[PDB]
């Protein structure tokens, strides 16, 4: 039984991607200081405890599920699509999410506000004519006052309905103050939608929509994610744990319940 570790995660044979200052979700959405991870791949994503967010304050209803799905997909390969947002201003940004000197936003998201004095009922559609699954990431803005709601989206109450033939999600935005995060009581909530082959994404909204810019290519492989602070090293080791890479020669182990690769069983 293996009860000791080297203290270091070996960079072979598996492709290890060090997240450094970024969680996988921040990389997915396109937090400016995670832009280097655009279009990256991994057999194992390593989330460090030093990770932080530095964009618009946000949460994810059902965080752990989305995180797991993306981690298992093992890629952030984005494909921009031509979404036609008729009658609304695009590319909304913030000082809470700087990219370079100027104000910016999540790179994979498109913050739609009013155009002139009107916010029309948006209704776009986007079929999946490919043979693989598309992952769309979108959200809803929750203003902290009514003043903000009517300044940004005109209508006193917003609504976001993203749907496919199988499933549907309608969100009504909650107008009210949250705890102050980097000078902002307002929030964005993130939702996701999978669109299978032959199926059609339909987004419809009269306010508060944080629109998607395209999709992410989904795969099913050996990819996964792990929380660890152990540094990376130029060695070979089949088994990886959070406490470090371990020899798998012995039939069992009790270094950690969480493992990746061809490993001994936990006791």
């Amino acid at each position: 039984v293996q009860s000791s570790s080297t203290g270091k995660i070996c960079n072979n044979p598996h492709r290890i991607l060090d997240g450094i200052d970024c969680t996988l979700i921040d990389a997915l959405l396109g937090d400016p200081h995670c832009d280097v991870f655009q279009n990256e791949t991994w057999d194992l994503f390593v989330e460090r405890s030093k990770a932080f967010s530095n964009c618009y304050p946000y949460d994810v209803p059902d965080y752990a599920s989305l995180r797991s799905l993306v981690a298992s997909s093992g890629t952030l390969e984005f494909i921009t699509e031509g979404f036609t947002w008729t009658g609304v201003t695009q590319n909304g940004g913030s000082n809470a999410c700087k990219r370079g000197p100027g104000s910016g936003f999540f790179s994979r998201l498109n913050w739609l506000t009013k155009s002139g004095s009107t916010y029309p009922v948006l209704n776009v559609t986007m079929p999946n004519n490919d043979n693989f699954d598309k992952l769309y990431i979108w959200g809803v803005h929750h203003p902290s006052t009514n003043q903000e709601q009517t300044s940004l989206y005109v209508q006193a109450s917003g609504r976001v309905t993203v749907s496919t033939r199988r499933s549907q999600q309608t969100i009504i935005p909650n107008i009210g103050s949250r705890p102050w995060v980097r000078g902002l009581s307002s929030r964005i909530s993130i939702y996701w939608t999978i669109v299978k082959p032959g199926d059609v994404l339909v987004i419809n909204s009269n306010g508060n929509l944080i629109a998607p810019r395209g999709y992410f290519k989904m795969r099913t492989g050996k990819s996964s994610i792990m929380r660890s602070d152990a540094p990376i090293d130029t060695c070979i080791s089949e088994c990886i744990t959070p406490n470090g890479s371990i020899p798998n020669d012995k039939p069992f182990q009790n270094v950690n319940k969480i493992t990746y690769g061809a490993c001994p069983k936990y006791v």
Partner: antibody
Amino acid sequence: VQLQESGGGLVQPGESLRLSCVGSGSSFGESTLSYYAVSWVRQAPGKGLEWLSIINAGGGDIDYADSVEGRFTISRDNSKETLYLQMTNLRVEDTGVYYCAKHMSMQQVPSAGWEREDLVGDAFDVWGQGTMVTVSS
Amino acid sequence: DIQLTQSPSSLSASVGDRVTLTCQASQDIRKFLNWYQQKPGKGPKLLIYDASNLQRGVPSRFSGGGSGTDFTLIISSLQPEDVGTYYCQQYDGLPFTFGGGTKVVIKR
């Protein structure tokens, strides 16, 4: 929104003079002047309108005309709903009435933390009454 | 820098006449163009924004048209109050400029 200017007066050629412009009230929603981009515009006696300087809602994306570049500095204090035009090294031909003029398209919502990435700088939908600046000896 | 040339420089028409002011442009400015009514001893007020759009509050008798380089501001029925100078203004590119002016006078 309504606007009003102040700070105008008599000055000697070469002197400095600050002009202020206070915004008051509410437009669509309850949006104050701090939601908008504003520019300074002057009119010499018996002449046309000359655009001077623009500033985006949040204080960035500033540009000038060649006639006043290097000498004039545009700036704003949104906590006070006020715009400023500092003028230095003034000359006789800078004489005229100075207007504050708001661009209509909303550029920010401060309480929300939104900013439009493109500076539209479109139609001057609100003007002040104007303030008289005179440069002489 | 984009120059705007208005025509005429000065005009006279009777109460209820159809009046045509024009603004011509140094280059293609698409429809990034506005019009303004400066009354005498008072500040400018927006009439037309973005080539053709009438401002809320401004009488229906005023209208706007054009694109590219040529643009028109029509008064369908000139009134006593409609005296004063009219300016066209562009914002296609910096620096922003105004027209020379068109002074309108009532003929009685």
